[PDB]
C-alpha cells in the first residue's frame, strides 16, 4: 500500500491541526534551516511507534506543542497516518498523547502497542526493525563495515542471529559426545550431531534466504546507481558452507576500474558502492514506503543526480519514496514537494505547503 497522508495536532512545532500531504509516489520534504523538517521526521517515527528516548525528549508530554517551555497548547497531541491500498478501505494508524502516555488507535479503535505493531507488520512496516527508515548517516555507516560486520548485519536482518546461541550450545554438546566415542556412546554422538545439523541447517537457511536475495539484487542496483552498464558488484561469503561463521566479502568493478574489494574504493565511488549495498539490503524485507532522512547530505555533485534518478525510477513501481532533502539536484526529481516554513509565535511554529512538480518540463 501507500502512505497517503499524515495528520498532526499540536505535535512539537506543528501547532494546531495540520494535514501533511497527500504524498505522491516520490515526495520530498524541504525547507530552510529550522526545527520543522526534523520535527516532521520525528512525527513519522512517533506514529510508527518510536520510543520516547529516541524522540529527543525525556517525557512524552514534552512532545505537545509548547510543553518544553511550560506553555503547552493543549493536554493532548497526536499524529495519525492514513495508509491506502488499492482495492481496500483506507486504514488510519494514530498515536495520541493522553494523560502523558501513549494511546494507540487503528481506525479510531483503541488498541495496545502489541496489536498496533502486529497490524503494521502485516503491511510490511516493521516498527522495531525500522525497515522503512534510512537514518541520516546510514550510508557512511554501511561504507565502514568490514566483512565480519557485514555478516553481523545479515544475521540481524535475516533473524539467523537469533539461532546463534542455540547453534553454539548444540555444537558444544556435539563435540563432547563425539569426544567420548559402548554402542550407546555411538548412539549419543549420532543424535548429538543430528540435533546440531538441524540448527545448522536452520541457521543456514535463514541466513541464505536473506543473503542470496541481497546478493542477487546488488549488481543491477549498482549498475542503476552508476548509470553504467559496465559497473559490477559482488557479494560473497568467505565461508560458503557456513556464511554466518566468517565475513561477507564485497567486491566491485567501478565503471573504469578493476575487480577490487569495496574497501579499496574512495570518495564518491565508495559512497555509490555503499549506497548499492544499503539499497540491496533494503530490497529484502522492503517496506511499502521508504523514508530517506537527508541521504543526499552524503552525496556530491558527481553522483547526486544519479542517486536521485535511481530513487525516481524505483518510486514508479517498487516502493514509495519520502525523502527529507536539502539539495535541489536531489529533490527536483520528486513528483511533489512538501515545503516546511516557520511562523512567528511564543514557540516556533511549523506549517507546510504542497507543490506539484510534475506540471513542469525537465531541463
Amino acid at each position: 500500500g501507500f502512505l497517503k497522508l499524515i495528520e498532526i495536532e499540536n505535535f512539537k512545532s506543528y501547532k494546531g491541526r495540520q494535514i501533511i500531504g497527500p504524498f505522491q509516489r516520490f515526495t520530498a520534504i524541504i525547507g530552510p534551516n529550522g526545527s520543522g523538517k526534523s520535527n516532521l521526521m520525528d512525527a513519522i517515527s512517533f506514529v510508527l511507534g518510536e520510543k520516547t528516548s529516541n524522540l529527543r525528549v525525556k517525557t512524552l508530554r514534552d512532545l505537545i506543542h509548547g510543553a518544553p517551555v511550560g506553555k503547552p497548547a493543549a493536554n493532548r497531541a497526536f499524529v495519525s497516518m492514513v495508509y491506502s491500498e488499492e482495492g481496500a478501505e483506507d486504514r488510519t494508524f494514530a498515536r495520541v498523547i493522553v494523560g502523558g502516555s501513549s494511546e494507540y488507535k487503528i481506525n479510531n479503535k483503541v488498541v495496545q502497542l502489541h496489536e498496533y505493531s502486529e497490524e503494521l507488520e502485516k503491511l510490511g512496516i516493521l516498527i522495531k526493525a525500522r525497515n522503512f527508515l534510512v537514518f541520516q548517516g546510514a550510508v557512511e555507516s554501511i561504507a565502514m563495515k568490514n566483512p565480519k560486520e557485514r555478516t553481523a548485519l545479515f544475521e540481524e536482518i535475516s533473524r539467523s542471529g537469533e539461532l546463534a546461541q542455540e547453534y553454539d550450545k548444540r555444537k558444544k554438546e556435539m563435540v563432547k559426545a563425539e569426544e567420548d566415542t559402548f554402542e550407546a556412546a555411538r548412539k549419543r554422538a549420532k543424535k548429538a550431531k543430528q540435533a546440531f545439523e538441524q540448527i545448522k541447517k536452520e541457521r543456514f537457511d535463514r541466513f541464505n534466504a536473506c543473503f542470496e536475495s541481497v546478493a542477487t539484487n546488488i549488481d543491477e542496483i549498482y549498475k542503476a546507481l552508476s548509470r553504467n552498464s559496465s559497473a559490477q558488484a559482488f557479494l560473497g561469503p568467505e565461508n560458503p558452507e557456513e556464511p554466518y561463521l566468517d565475513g561477507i566479502n564485497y567486491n566491485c568493478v567501478a565503471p573504469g576500474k578493476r575487480f577490487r574489494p569495496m574497501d579499496n574504493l574512495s570518495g564518491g565511488e565508495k559512497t555509490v558502492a555503499a549506497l548499492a549495498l544499503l539499497f540491496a539490503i533494503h530490497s529484502y524485507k522492503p517496506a511499502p514506503f521508504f523514508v530517506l532522512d537527508q541521504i543526499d547530505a552524503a552525496l556530491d555533485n558527481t553522483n547526486i543526480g544519479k542517486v536521485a534518478n535511481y530513487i525516481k525510477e524505483q518510486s514508479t513501481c517498487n516502493f514509495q519514496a519520502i525523502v527529507i532533502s536539502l539539495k535541489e539536484e536531489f529533490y527536483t526529481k520528486a513528483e511533489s514537494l512538501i515545503g516546511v516554513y516557520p511562523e512567528q509565535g511564543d514557540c516556533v511554529i511549523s506549517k507546510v505547503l504542497t507543490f506539484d512538480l510534475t506540471k513542469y518540463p525537465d531541463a
Binding site: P22, G339, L353, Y360
Partner: protein
C-alpha cells in the same frame, strides 16, 4: 496586493519552479511575505509581510 506562485511558475521548468517555491519558504521565514494555501496542491498566494515594505513585484 498579492503574487500567485502558480503564475510565477507558468512557463518555468522543474528546477525553476522548485526554486520559486523554495523562495516562498525562505521569504516567509524572513517575514518579507505572508503565505496562504487554500487546500493541498492549490495555488499559493504571497502577500506583504511585516519585515519588508517595498513592492512584491520587486521581490520576485
Amino acid at each position: 496586493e498579492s503574487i500567485s506562485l502558480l503564475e510565477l511558475c507558468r512557463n518555468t521548468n522543474r528546477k525553476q519552479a522548485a526554486a520559486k517555491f523554495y523562495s516562498f519558504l525562505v521569504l516567509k521565514k524572513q517575514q518579507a511575505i505572508e503565505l496562504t494555501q487554500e487546500e493541498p496542491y492549490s495555488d499559493i498566494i504571497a502577500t506583504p509581510g511585516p519585515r519588508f515594505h517595498g513592492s512584491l513585484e520587486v521581490l520576485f
